[PDB]
Amino acid sequence: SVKIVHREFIASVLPSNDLTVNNGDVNIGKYRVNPSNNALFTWLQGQAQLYDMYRFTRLRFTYIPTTGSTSTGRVSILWDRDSQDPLPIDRAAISSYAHYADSAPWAENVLVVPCDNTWRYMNDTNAVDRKLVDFGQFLFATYSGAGATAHGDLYVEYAVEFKDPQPIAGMVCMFDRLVSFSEVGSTIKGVNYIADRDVITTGGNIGVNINIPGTYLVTIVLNATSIGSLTFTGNSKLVGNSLNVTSSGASALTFTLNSTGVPNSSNSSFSVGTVVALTRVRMTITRCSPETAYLA
């Protein structure tokens, strides 16, 4: 009924010698094809939030190199119609799939997925049998490569129908960890900018990784005796001014950053250091534009 067509950036593919699916992210639905999934639909989610159901009419995944011709290996692009199926573990398994394509890192590539006629629900975040609410899942892989500089970028282009206007689902993500209970696990609500493993909370450090490209507004409230420095030594850069309030027992930082989306295992998107007796982390992340950055 409401007919949208668009093309949008998904992720940059990091080189790897061993097989690496989805840049090393282990989660099964990472790129479930559902417009709510902001990891796949970096742009569409902003519209998806306003509607109840979707149906893809055309759908293709594109790979455009950003690397040199002397880069070795391959980049695989891949679609499984079962969004709950496990990630493949070896290169041969990738070739077992009906819908995949594979090429040099220096070559453009495309994977066309034939769409069906069935409508499915926009929210999949409550749903348990997610295959019934997703039009499969996208996956990418790379192997036989080397280097820190990404091979190329993946994109999704589609024509999709949305069905029913609804109260907005919103563009905000809320994260909450009771670190006093455990340094892992959390309650996450709203849009899936981050997943539990993306917030590292250990050894007197807090690192959070926004591994989805874009500009975001964050507010972290920290329950902790004292904190040290906010740093941006990873895939993100501070936009405008950072607003920091520190007290004995609690701290709040709010700022908008610009993430490259590409995961970094050494440096988080932002980190806060020398953190003493962290009991609780509560946070809010919202995709936005840079126009609303805080001023000096």
**In the complex, minimum distance from the CB of residue 188 to a copy of itself, in angstroms, rounded to a whole number:** 10
CA separation for the pair 43, 124 (Å, rounded): 18
Among 8, 20, 27, 52, binds Ca ion (CB under 5 A): 52
Span of 29-37, 143-151, 198-206, 266-274 interacting with a copy of itself by CB under 8 A: 143-151
**Two tokens, residue 58:** 């055309």
Using CA of residue 20, residue 45, residue 36, residue 107, what is the dihedral sign?
Answer: negative
Which residues lie closer than 8 Å to 247 by C-beta, 6 or more apart?
A: none
Here's the x/- map for a copy of itself, 94-123, by CB under 8 A: it reads as xxxxxxxxxxx-xx-x-x---------x--
CA separation for the pair 172, 191 (Å, rounded): 6
Among 58, 237, 274, 277, binds a copy of itself (CB under 8 A): 237
**In the complex, minimum distance from the CB of residue 55 to a copy of itself, in angstroms, rounded to a whole number:** 13
Residue carrying structure tokens 């005796």: 225
| By the rule CB under 8 A, 37 interacts with a copy of itself | no
| By the rule CB under 5 A, 166 interacts with Ca ion | yes
- Helix, coil or strand: residue 159: strand
| By the rule CB under 5 A, 85 interacts with Ca ion | yes
**In the complex, minimum distance from the CB of residue 119 to Ca ion, in angstroms, rounded to a whole number:** 12
**Residue 77 carries which side chain, given as an amino acid letter?**
I
The number of C-alpha atoms within 13 Å of 50 and in the hemisphere containing its C-beta is 7
CA separation for the pair 279, 250 (Å, rounded): 10
Which positions from 121 through 150 interact with Ca ion, judged by CB under 5 A?
124
Q: Which does 204 bind (CB under 5 to 8 A by kind): a copy of itself, Ca ion, none?
A: none
Pick the closer one to Ca ion by CB: 151 or 287. Answer: 287
